[PDB]
Amino acid sequence: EAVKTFNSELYSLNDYKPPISKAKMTQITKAAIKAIKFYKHVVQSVEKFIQKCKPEYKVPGLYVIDSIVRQSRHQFGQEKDVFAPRFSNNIISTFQNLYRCPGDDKSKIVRVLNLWQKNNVFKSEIIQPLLDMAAALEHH
């Protein structure tokens, strides 16, 4: 029911042409952060969305991950945030899906990865492979 609400905010992205408003992302985030007891289901729903959504929503879906993890780290502390560690489990697969996006949108993905590294959102054993993955795509 906390999860139902989050699911409802997340999937209502399909009502909107990106760019998505700050307000909508904040709504999705608050639903996630308020559903923190069920963080595993929240991560699962975000990953499912990223797997299934149309190409135009890949960056929105990544911004959901960004927004949730950065809010959580700020609200609960970097040490204590459950979101980034749980997102880390499947994150390589998650990015494989994110990169089925319009070519014009890859620069946005790399920008978030860069910010994540600078802000130590994920430890470098996570971030660098993801960064490696972006580099490898323009080559092919």
Partner: peptide, 10 residues
């Protein structure tokens, strides 16, 4: 949304 936007707090 911007990935540099400030997080919310009291």
């Amino acid at each position: 949304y911007s990935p540099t936007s400030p997080s919310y707090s009291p």
